[PDB]
Amino acid sequence: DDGTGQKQIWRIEGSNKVPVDPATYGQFYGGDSYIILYNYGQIIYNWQGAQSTQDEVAASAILTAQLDEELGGTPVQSRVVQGKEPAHLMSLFGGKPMIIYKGGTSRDGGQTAPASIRLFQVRASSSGATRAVEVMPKSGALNSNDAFVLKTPSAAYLWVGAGASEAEKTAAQELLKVLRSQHVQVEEGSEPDGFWEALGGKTSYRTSPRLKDKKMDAHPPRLFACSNRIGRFVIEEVPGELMQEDLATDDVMLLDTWDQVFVWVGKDSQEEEKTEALTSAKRYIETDPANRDRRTPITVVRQGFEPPSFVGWFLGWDNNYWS
Ligand SMILES: [Ca+2]
Ligand SMILES: [Ca+2]
C-alpha cells in the first residue's frame, strides 16, 4: 500500500527480540537480523543482514514464528535478505532511504562501535528505492555511478559521481542528517585534497564511461546466473540489487551492461559452463542488432581478478570476500 501504516521493529540479539529505537527505524545493522511488523491484514518481514551471524538468523526464525502465532497465524510471514528487499518494505520509511551500518551485535561480542572515518555508498533503484551501505573508507571504493558520504570526526564530504541520480543525491543528505554532520558537497573530479586524505589514498576507483552515463536507464545492467548442474545449461536472472554474494562461485555469471557484456568465471565453475556462457553472451548481443551495435565486446573476467569498471556495478565489494 504505502508503508505509511504503523509498524514495530525488533533486532534479534542472542535469542531475544529487543525493540529498535523508533527514530532510528530506517537504519539497520548488517551484522544482525531484524523482525518488523506491518499493518495494511498484517505482514511480518524477517530481514537478514548480509553479515548476520548464523545463530542470529536461526533464532530469528524461532521468534518470527511465535509472533505470527500470537496474532493467530493471520499475518503473512515474509523472509528477506539485505539488498533484495521488496518495493513495499522499502516504502515503510516514508521518503527516507535505508541506511545499512556495518557491524552490529552477537552472542559473546556485544554491540560494536562505529569508527570515526566512515564511508557510505548511496545507490538508488530504477523505481527510486535508495539504500546507503557502509563501506571501507578507501578511495578504491568510490564509484562514478553513485553518491557517497565520507564522514570524519570533524567534517564530512558529499561526493557525487557523474552517474549519480537525483534520488541518490538527496538520499545522501538524508544520511548526513542521521550522521549529524555539516557536509560539503563535492562533484566527482574537483575534490579537495582534504578529502583523499581521509580515504588515505591517491585515487583509482571504479569508473567507466558507462558508469557515468545518464541514459543507463534505457537498459540498466542485468546480471544472469548460468549453471549446468542439472545436465543442461540453464540461465537465470539475478533479482534485486546486484551483490557480490550473487556471483555463483560454482558457476558462471553474465553481466550485460549493454555497451559491453562481461562473463564472470566462478573459481569452481566447469569448463563447459564457461563455453556455453560465452555463446550465450553472443546470442544476447545478436538478439536485436538494429538497436545493438554488432561490435559489442564480450569480456571474460575471473573471480578475484575483476576490473573496477565491473565491480563498480555492485553495491558494496569486499576485496577479501572469497578469501
Ligand atoms: Ca547510480
Ligand atoms: Ca557449476
Side-chain angles (χ1 to χ4, degrees), residues 1-19 21-39 41-42 45-52 54 58-61 63 65-66 68-90 92-168 170-181 183-198 200-201 203-213 215-266 268-271 273-323:
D1 51 6
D2 288 321
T4 55
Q6 193 192 60
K7 59 185 176 297
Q8 304 177 59
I9 303 173
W10 296 274
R11 187 267 229 74
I12 54 87
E13 298 168 358
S15 57
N16 272 252
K17 187 184 68 172
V18 314
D21 185 303
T24 72
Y25 270 1
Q27 298 81 271
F28 301 87
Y29 273 101
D32 295 87
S33 289
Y34 289 65
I35 306 179
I36 83 100
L37 184 269
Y38 182 70
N39 322 279
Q42 303 173 299
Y45 285 124
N46 198 178
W47 200 85
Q48 178 188 179
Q51 316 110 221
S52 180
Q54 203 314 303
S60 164
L63 284 166
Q66 319 171 185
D68 170 284
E69 140 278 296
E70 282 173 44
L71 289 170
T74 58
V76 185
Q77 307 197 55
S78 182
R79 277 205 51 65
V80 276
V81 198
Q82 193 176 320
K84 316 297 188 171
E85 310 85 7
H88 186 59
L89 177 53
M90 288 309 275
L92 273 57
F93 327 82
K96 293 71 186 66
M98 174 181 187
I99 317 309
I100 315 293
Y101 300 145
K102 187 157 51 167
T105 324
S106 49
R107 308 205 67 66
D108 65 309
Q111 169 57 37
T112 53
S116 58
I117 294 176
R118 302 172 64 181
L119 182 49
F120 298 68
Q121 189 191 318
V122 183
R123 174 177 293 186
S125 164
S126 286
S127 66
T130 46
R131 304 180 177 62
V133 186
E134 168 154 39
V135 301
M136 205 84 272
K138 305 299 181 182
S139 345
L142 271 297
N143 159 29
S144 322
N145 182 266
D146 301 331
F148 291 62
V149 172
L150 203 205
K151 160 63 162 46
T152 83
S154 190
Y157 309 111
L158 198 188
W159 187 92
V160 38
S165 70
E166 268 308 304
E168 309 192 318
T170 78
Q173 279 139 173
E174 215 53 57
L175 201 214
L176 265 308
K177 293 177 168 71
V178 187
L179 302 168
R180 298 169 186 168
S181 177
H183 77 81
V184 199
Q185 182 178 312
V186 28
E187 304 300 303
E188 172 177 22
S190 40
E191 50 282 287
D193 293 75
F195 163 92
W196 298 111
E197 125 251 279
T203 317
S204 333
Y205 50 92
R206 328 176 196 310
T207 331
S208 80
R210 181 89 175 63
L211 286 165
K212 299 177 179 173
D213 236 328
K215 41 53 67 184
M216 78 208 115
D217 320 307
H219 11 63
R222 276 159 181 282
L223 172 62
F224 300 91
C226 328
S227 169
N228 176 357
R229 67 159 160 291
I230 66 162
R232 275 288 332 116
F233 187 76
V234 20
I235 309 175
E236 214 171 315
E237 167 162 39
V238 177
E241 288 294 350
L242 314 183
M243 299 193 90
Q244 178 161 59
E245 172 58 342
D246 287 312
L247 302 176
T249 257
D250 267 24
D251 293 319
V252 179
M253 263 25 189
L254 245 58
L255 216 214
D256 189 343
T257 70
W258 184 260
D259 83 309
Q260 158 179 43
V261 179
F262 300 99
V263 50
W264 189 80
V265 176
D268 293 297
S269 70
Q270 281 186 286
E271 202 69 293
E273 242 148 43
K274 171 175 173 174
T275 302
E276 307 209 27
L278 291 173
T279 303
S280 281
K282 178 172 182 291
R283 92 166 186 283
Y284 278 149
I285 305 176
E286 311 184 325
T287 206
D288 185 4
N291 290 304
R292 200 154 173 174
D293 144 38
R294 304 110 313 99
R295 280 141 45 72
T296 303
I298 142 65
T299 302
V300 185
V301 306
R302 50 198 165 84
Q303 186 180 319
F305 305 79
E306 40 285 296
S309 63
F310 169 85
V311 302
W313 288 110
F314 299 71
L315 175 58
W317 189 269
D318 180 10
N319 292 318
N320 324 289
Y321 184 106
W322 299 293
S323 192

